[PDB]
Design a protein around this ligand. Structure first.
Ligand SMILES: Nc1ncnc2c1ncn2[C@@H]1O[C@H](COP(=O)(O)OP(=O)(O)O)[C@@H](O)[C@H]1O
Ligand SMILES: Nc1nc2c(ncn2[C@@H]2O[C@H](COP(=O)(O)O)[C@@H](O)[C@H]2O)c(=O)[nH]1
Ligand code: ALF
Ligand SMILES: [K+]
Ligand SMILES: [Mg+2]
Length: 193
């Protein structure tokens, strides 16, 4: 009836992070980022407590047994999870929770009662995704290949009926960001009432 959380997914290197950062900055009073937990090493320019909760695998696994995570899955040999407190933190600020998860996270979230909107940020082609991943250069050659492999599997699943409410083709960043705003108009209107 009113505002609902937002689940944004897609293949690695498809522009999900950049689209969210512009959305969060331009709409700080509407959207709050869900800070997931990860076991991978921090990228340059990454800050703990904002992009992720950078923890070791022992710390992450101790939290899984403690039940701190609404969802969790492994990706590229590193652990990821959405903590229950991460969603509650955004809810405590009267903001729409925006989550960045993989395909496994989306299916896990389909079980939960958050009832979010599902947005898939897709590249124009698989080859373009490789170039954008290679330009970022934050992954090893082996990690890039398996990230490419998971991209195509998530690419085909993006066409699953009823999985993604809205699919964004990330060809032009301005065009993709405009489409993101348009699909979020109902959420922004609901939050502002
Ligand atoms: N519209 C676009 N055109 C060209 N490159 C883009 C576009 N959007 C994003 N990128 C590339 O994607 C990279 C960042 O991707 P990122 O959002 O971190 O991937 P993920 O979706 O896994 O978070 C940047 O290096 C940027 O060059
Ligand atoms: N299941 C799940 N996946 C996540 C979570 N956070 C990030 N991911 C996904 O894991 C991958 C990690 O990408 P990175 O953040 O290392 O660039 C991305 O596909 C991202 O969407 C999470 O909390 N849970
Ligand atoms: F969210 Al990414 F590579 F930046 F999976
Ligand atoms: K996240
Ligand atoms: Mg990201």
């Amino acid at each position: 009836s009113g505002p609902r959380p937002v689940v944004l997914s897609g293949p690695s290197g498809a522009g999900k992070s950049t689209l969210l950062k512009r959305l969060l900055q331009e709409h700080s009073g509407i959207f709050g980022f869900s800070v997931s937990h990860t076991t991978r090493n921090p990228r340059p320019g990454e800050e703990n407590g904002k992009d992720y909760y950078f923890v070791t695998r022992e710390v992450m696994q101790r939290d899984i047994a403690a039940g701190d995570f609404i969802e969790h899955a492994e990706f590229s040999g590193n652990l990821y999870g959405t903590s229950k407190v991460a969603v509650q933190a955004v809810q405590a600020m009267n903001r729409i929770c925006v989550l960045d998860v993989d395909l496994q996270g989306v299916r896990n979230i389909k079980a939960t009662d958050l009832r979010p909107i599902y947005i898939s940020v897709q590249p124009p082609s698989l080859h373009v995704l490789e170039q954008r991943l290679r330009q970022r250069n934050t992954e090893t050659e082996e990690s890039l290949v398996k990230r490419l492999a998971a991209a195509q599997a998530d690419m085909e699943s993006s066409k699953e009926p009823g999985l993604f409410d809205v699919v964004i083709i990330n060809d032009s960043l301005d065009q993709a960001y405009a489409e993101l705003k348009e699909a979020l108009s109902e959420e922004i209107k609901k939050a502002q009432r």
